[PDB]
Amino acid sequence: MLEDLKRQVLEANLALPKHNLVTLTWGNVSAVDRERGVFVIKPSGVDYSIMTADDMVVVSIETGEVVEGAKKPSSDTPTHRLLYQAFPSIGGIVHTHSRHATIWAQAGQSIPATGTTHANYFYGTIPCTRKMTDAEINGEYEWETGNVIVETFEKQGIDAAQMPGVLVHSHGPFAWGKNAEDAVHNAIVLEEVAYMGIFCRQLAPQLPDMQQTLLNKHYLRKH
């Protein structure tokens, strides 16, 4: 029904393995069409090497019901859905277990801004969520994963339009952007700064976060 959108999502999903952000069939990308009140996401149970635009599922932003698609949508759909409702300014969402961002997630630590690379895409510390409670995990898990992300941002007063990424404790990174592609680009940068953050800490364990002035210069410049 939104072929050009299914195209953008399809291509973004195929970009995941190309940029070495995923292995096997992990990861998923989706894009939203606000006026349509629906979002398109990667299908569940489909290899990237077989995946076609027609496999992309159409889901209702409001009810989470599949508006079009023969395939089952990604099991992470509720999280995507929740985030679209919570963050009005986002147009695309990426979820992967990219190695280095996931290392930070598993460590339960937030990625501090120590470089201009990071400053160009994330306005400050990339937050790692608190652990989910036993209740949240055994309840509507994916949806709750979304709630934990949103709570993290509200409690810490972080603007989602200025921080297109987050780490889910013991799980992995979630990133987003203006559209499917933009979302994928933010995901690849999140992985890059995660990688560099590990080793810059090793070289300088008592390294202070970058100068606020430098952070501002680079983030405010773009956007």
Q: Which residues bind a second copy (CB under 8 A)?
A: 23-24, 26, 97, 99-100, 102-109, 114-117, 131-132, 134, 137-138, 141, 170-172, 185, 188-189, 192, 195-196, 198-204, 207, 210-211, 213-214, 217
Using the minimum distance from each CB to Zn ion, give the nearer residue, 5 or 119. 119
Nearest to 110 by CA among 164, 150, 151, 165: 165
Q: Measured from the CB atom, is 6 or 42 closer to a second copy?
A: 42
Rounded least distance, CB 2 to Zn ion, Å: 26
Nearest approach, Cβ of residue 98 and Zn ion (Å): 11
Residues ≥6 apart with Cβ < 8 Å to 172: 95, 96, 97, 98, 101, 102, 105
Burial 128-146 (b: 16+ CB within 10 A, else e): bbeebeeeeeeeeeebbbb
Find which of Zn ion, a second copy, none residue 162 binds, CB within 5 to 8 Å per kind: none
Q: Which of Zn ion, a second copy, none is residue 67 near (CB under 5 to 8 Å by kind)? A: none
Strands 66-68 and 92-95: unpaired
Q: Of Zn ion, a second copy, none, which one does residue 50 interact with (CB within 5 to 8 Å by kind)?
A: none
Q: Which is nearer to a second copy, 82 or 188 (CB)?
A: 188
Residue nearest to Zn ion (CB): 172
Count CB neighbours of 170 within 10 A.
14
The tokens 């709630």 sit on which residue? 147
CB within 8 Å of 189: residues ≥ 6 apart = 117, 118, 120, 121, 122
Site string for Zn ion, 157-176 (x = CB under 5 A): ---------------x----
Write out the two tokens for 12. 């973004």
Q: Which does 192 bind (CB under 5 to 8 A by kind): a second copy, Zn ion, none?
A: a second copy
Closest CA to 164 of 103, 99, 219, 98: 219
Residue with smaller CB distance to a second copy, 117 or 125: 117
Cβ-Cβ contacts under 8 Å for 223 (sequence gap 6 or more): 162
Considering beta carbons, is residue 127 or 172 the nearer one to Zn ion? 172
